[PDB]
Structure 1
Amino acid sequence: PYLDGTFYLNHTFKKVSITFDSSVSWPGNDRLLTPNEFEIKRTVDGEGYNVAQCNMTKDWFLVQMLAHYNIGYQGFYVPEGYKDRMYSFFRNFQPMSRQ
């Protein structure tokens, strides 16, 4: 995975906090729905901060559609065919559910 594009454990992250100091945190001038951590995913969700039909936080989805494409502040849309590549986020994201 190191020397090739292959990767397959990106869903095994829970949160990253990019701490700078222990009274504030990196982007943390009030910006995100959880301003002190990037939650990648929620195990249980009272607030409704999941985005449809998977665990991913609304904050994280916003960040990863503005990291790879620049859409989020004009509302989400399906990226163009040349903006979406084999290593780009959008076409490798696969929500799922079962009972």
Structure 2
Amino acid sequence: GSIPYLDGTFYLNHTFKKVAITFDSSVSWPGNDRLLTPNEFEIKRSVDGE
């Protein structure tokens, strides 16, 4: 079929919940109270009350 690795036909983007980037096991990135949940990149929420 189509090879998404080679042609750019990516389709599993919706299957991401969150992303936690921690440089050097203690420094959360971007840190610095940047985001609304500043230690992780919440891509989507199933249960949102706030």
CA RMSD of aligned residues (A): 1.3
Structure 2 gap segments, 5+ residues each: none
Q: Distance in 1 between matches of 2:35 and 2:29?
A: 11
Q: TM-score, length-normalised on structure 1?
A: 0.44
Q: Secondary structure at the match of 1:2?
A: helix
The corresponding residue for 1:38 is 41
Structure number with the higher strand fraction is 2
The alpha-carbon deviation at position 20 of structure 1 amounts to: 1.9
Structure 1 gap segments, 5+ residues each: 48-99
CA contact (8 A) 1:15 1:38 kept: yes
Could you say which structure has the greater relative contact order, defined with CA pairs below 8 angstroms and 6 or more residues apart? Answer: 2
Q: Distance in 1 between matches of 2:39 and 2:24?
A: 11
Q: TM-score, length-normalised on structure 2?
A: 0.83
Q: Distance in 2 between matches of 1:28 and 1:17?
A: 11
Structure 1, residues 1-44: CA drift from partner, whole Å, max 9, x if none? 01101010000000111112455401110100000000000010
The corresponding residue for 1:20 is 23
Q: Distance in 1 between matches of 2:27 and 2:48?
A: 24
Runs (4 or more) in structure 1 with deviation over 4 Å come to none
Query: Residue 22 and residue 3 in structure 1: after superposition, are their counterparts in 2 closer, same or farther (change >3 A)?
Result: closer
Select 2:32's aligned residue among 20, 29, 34. Answer: 29
